[PDB]
């Protein structure tokens, strides 16, 4: 066990190993209760998140366990990973606080598009890295579900990582129509719809579908992709949903070349394959990596899949102290990543 030291920052008690120095809060609460710190073992800047009221309810306790499980799993270049996890507690009985350590990322894409309209080369490289991380996540049967520019972090070298900061940029603007609506018939490709919306915004400098609500959002979407045909209508099981869709005056699919005018036609083609209403016909991440648009980056020998992830906990209903105990187990069993850098 290492030696901890205590301090206070902006309303909150922080107790961390001497290893981590010079804590400075970042983001004004936009990312949680998070500090930049200097890690004395590597000489690298890191981010330290202290979880807020991790075991306050069964729901918090489960969310805490879930976040720690997901973070301990993620071992890929384009996905946030876990550098360390600790608590000042010496025993389960004392266990009340969870701290997570990750790399400190430079800026999010919300900032980087709200600066400029990117070059086609920058778009290629950023979307390629998103899809490479998604291939990995998806291969473990994990769905992100909340992809949007503020959940992607990029460093000065343009290296990108996928994260989820949790609850400016509305989620609904990037969300696939099938989980705007029924939340019933959906696959991993809900994340590919989000990548299509992100890529459009990078190319044009404008949010593709800036809806005010779920109805408006859907209206904007149908105006681009057109109203469902009989084949897609065949597969909507919700009567209310189906009634609403068919209630609208029918709309044709736009020619995406006339919408994204002047863009690389290969970018336009990929967007046609990502922004399809029918989720069974939407391109997967693994397929998108082989698309000609990424010819300069794609290497099929360097697009790894993940180890399997045991999500079986998700279907369990346990007590607070049980989720807490499990979370403690996971803190204890943590094996830090190689230092080599």
Q: Does 153 bind ligand O98 (CB under 6 A)?
A: yes
How many amino acids of this chain bind ligand O98 (CB under 6 A)?
A: 27
Which is nearest to 201 in space by CA: 244, 148, 238? 148
Q: Does 83 bind ligand O98 (CB under 6 A)?
A: no
**Cα–Cα distance for residue pair 3/25, rounded to 1 Å:** 22
**Cα–Cα distance for residue pair 111/156, rounded to 1 Å:** 13
**Cα–Cα distance for residue pair 48/19, rounded to 1 Å:** 12
Least distance to ligand O98, CB of residue 20, Å: 13
- Give the binding range for ligand O98 (CB under 6 A) out of 27-35, 247-255, 257-265, 326-334: 27-35
User: Restricting to residues 88-127, which ones interact with ligand O98 according to CB under 6 A?
Assistant: 100, 102, 104-108
In the stretch 60-79, what mask flags binding to ligand O98 with x, by CB under 6 A? -------x--xx--x----x
- Give the binding range for ligand O98 (CB under 6 A) out of 4-12, 25-33, 182-190, 285-293: 25-33
**Cα–Cα distance for residue pair 57/323, rounded to 1 Å:** 10
Indicate the annotated binding residues for ATP: 26-34, 49
Residue 86: beta bridge partners? 99
Least distance to ligand O98, CB of residue 58, Å: 17
Least distance to ligand O98, CB of residue 162, Å: 5
For residue 173, what are the CA distances in angstroms to 48, 216, 313?
A: 30, 10, 31
Question: DSSP label at 282?
Answer: S
Q: Of 104 and 245, which has the nearer Cβ to ligand O98?
A: 104
Q: Of 74 and 271, which has the nearer Cβ to ligand O98?
A: 74
3-state class (DSSP) for residue 83 = coil
Among 21, 27, 280, 307, binds ligand O98 (CB under 6 A): 27
The label of the residue with tokens 């209403």 reads: 277
Structure tokens at 14: 């922080």
Q: Which residues are catalytic?
A: 164
Q: Does 144 bind ligand O98 (CB under 6 A)?
A: yes
Least distance to ligand O98, CB of residue 61, Å: 14
Among 126, 127, 163, 200, binds ligand O98 (CB under 6 A): 163
**What is 138-188 written as a DSSP string?**
HHTT-------GGGEEE-TT--EEE--------GGGG--GGGTTTSSS--T
Contact set with ligand O98 (CB under 6 A): 26-27, 31, 34, 47, 49, 67, 70-71, 74, 79-80, 100, 102, 104-108, 137, 144, 153, 162-166
């Amino acid at each position: 066990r290492p030696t901890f030291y205590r301090q206070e920052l902006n309303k909150t008690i922080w107790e961390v190993p001497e290893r981590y120095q010079n804590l400075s809060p970042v983001g004004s609460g936009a990312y949680g209760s998070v500090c930049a710190a200097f890690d004395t073992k590597t000489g690298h800047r890191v981010a330290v998140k202290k979880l807020s009221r991790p075991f306050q309810s069964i729901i918090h306790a489960k969310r805490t366990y879930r976040e720690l499980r997901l973070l301990k799993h993620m071992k890929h270049e384009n996905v946030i990973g876990l550098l360390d996890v600790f608590t000042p507690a010496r025993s389960l009985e004392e266990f009340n606080d969870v701290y997570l350590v990750t790399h400190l990322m430079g800026a999010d894409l919300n900032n980087i598009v709200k600066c400029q309209k990117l070059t086609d080369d920058h778009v290629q490289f950023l979307i390629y890295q998103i899809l490479r991380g998604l291939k990995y996540i998806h291969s473990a049967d994990i769905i992100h579900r909340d992809l949007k520019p503020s959940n992607l972090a990029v460093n000065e070298d343009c290296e990108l990582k996928i994260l989820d900061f949790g609850l400016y940029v509305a989620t609904r603007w990037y969300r696939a129509p099938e989980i705007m609506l029924n939340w019933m018939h959906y696959n991993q490709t809900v994340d590919i719809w989000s990548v299509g919306c992100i890529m459009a915004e990078l190319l044009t400098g404008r949010t593709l579908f800036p809806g005010t609500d779920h109805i408006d959002q859907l209206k904007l979407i149908l105006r681009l992709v057109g109203t469902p045909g009989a084949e897609l209508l065949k597969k909507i099981s919700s009567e209310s949903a189906r009634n609403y869709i068919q209630s609208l005056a029918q709309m044709p699919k736009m020619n995406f070349a006339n919408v994204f005018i002047g863009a690389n036609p290969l970018a336009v083609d990929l967007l046609e394959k990502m922004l399809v209403l029918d989720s069974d016909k939407r391109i997967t991440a693994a397929q998108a990596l082989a698309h000609a648009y990424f010819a300069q980056y794609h290497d099929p020998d360097d697009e790894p899949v993940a180890d399997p992830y045991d999500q079986s906990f998700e279907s369990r209903d346990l007590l607070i102290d049980e989720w807490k105990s499990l979370t403690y187990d996971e803190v204890i069993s943590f094996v830090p990543p190689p230092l080599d850098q």
